[PDB]
């Protein structure tokens, strides 16, 4: 099909967090049917970033999801035309991130164009003070509403010292053409920063995602 067993990734993110503008470019690759991918990111403008890189990593494509053969795959069916998505991440004490991303295909690769806006983070909280250590593993509930696919996940943003804060994710996924709609299901996530330089100008992200009934 058009979605190959090995797909490359090219992306660019343009964003603003508490008024700090930045641009990040990425390249990577993954195995769409295994639900795995790796992306190598470089800050091109706005370095060094004055906030936690973890608020960006889940914005850096559900085509990289292992799906059982009996659950229609909203994401892979949308190609080559592709899909866009929009997400809000609501943090416990006023921070909010809104993301819009366009996922397209060019031959054996995906291109992402990502716009991200973070606002109202407490200046002395763990996001703006870079006191986070990653995300827990999560489960996203996927369900069709208004003819498009919605996903919600309740996440723990892990903190230095071993605590965490709650972050609620709500995403809307919109195929650019009609596809066969799945029934209610789940996607289990793991995302990790595998390596980074000291101020996260260079970062490698690894993600796994597996759907189940
Ligand atoms: Cl390529
Ligand atoms: Zn099979
Ligand atoms: Zn290629
Ligand atoms: Zn690890």
Swiss-Prot record:
GO biological process, one term: generation of precursor metabolites and energy
Tissue: Tentacle and oral disk.
Modified how: Contains a chromophore consisting of modified amino acid residues. The chromophore is formed by autocatalytic backbone condensation between Xaa-N and Gly-(N+2), oxidation of Tyr-(N+1) to didehydrotyrosine, and formation of a double bond to the alpha-amino nitrogen of residue Xaa-N. Maturation of the chromophore requires nothing other than molecular oxygen. The precise stereochemistry of the tyrosine has not been determined.
Domain of life: Eukaryota
Keyword Transmembrane: no
Keywords: Chromophore, Luminescence, Photoprotein
UniProt signal peptide: none
Biotechnology: Fluorescent proteins have become a useful and ubiquitous tool for making chimeric proteins, where they function as a fluorescent protein tag. Typically they tolerate N- and C-terminal fusion to a broad variety of proteins. They have been expressed in most known cell types and are used as a noninvasive fluorescent marker in living cells and organisms. They enable a wide range of applications where they have functioned as a cell lineage tracer, reporter of gene expression, or as a measure of protein-protein interactions.
Function: Pigment protein that is green in color.
Family: Belongs to the GFP family.
Name of the protein described by the UniProt record: GFP-like fluorescent chromoprotein cFP484
């Amino acid at each position: 099909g058009v979605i190959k067993p090995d797909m490359k990734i090219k992306l660019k993110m343009e964003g603003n967090v508490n008024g700090h503008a930045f641009v990040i470019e990425g390249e990577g690759e993954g195995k769409p049917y295994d639900g795995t991918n790796t992306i190598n990111l470089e800050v091109k403008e706005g370095a060094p970033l004055p906030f936690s890189y973890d608020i960006l990593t889940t914005a850096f494509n559900r085509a990289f999801t292992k799906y059982p053969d009996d659950i229609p795959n909203y994401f892979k069916q949308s190609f080559p035309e592709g899909y866009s998505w929009e997400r809000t991440m609501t943090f416990e004490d006023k921070g909010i991130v809104k993301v819009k991303s366009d996922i397209s295909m060019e031959e054996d690769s995906f291109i992402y164009e990502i716009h991200l806006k973070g606002e109202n983070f407490p200046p002395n909280g763990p996001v703006m003070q870079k006191k986070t250590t990653g995300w827990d593993a999560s489960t996203e509930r996927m369900y069709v509403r208004d003819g498009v696919l919605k996903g919600d996940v309740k996440h723990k943003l892990l903190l230095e010292g071993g605590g965490h804060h709650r972050v609620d994710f709500k995403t809307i996924y919109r195929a650019k053409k009609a596809v066969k709609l799945p029934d209610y299901h789940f996607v289990d996530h793991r995302i990790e920063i595998l390596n980074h330089d000291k101020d996260y100008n260079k970062v490698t992200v690894y993600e796994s995602a597996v759907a189940r009934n």
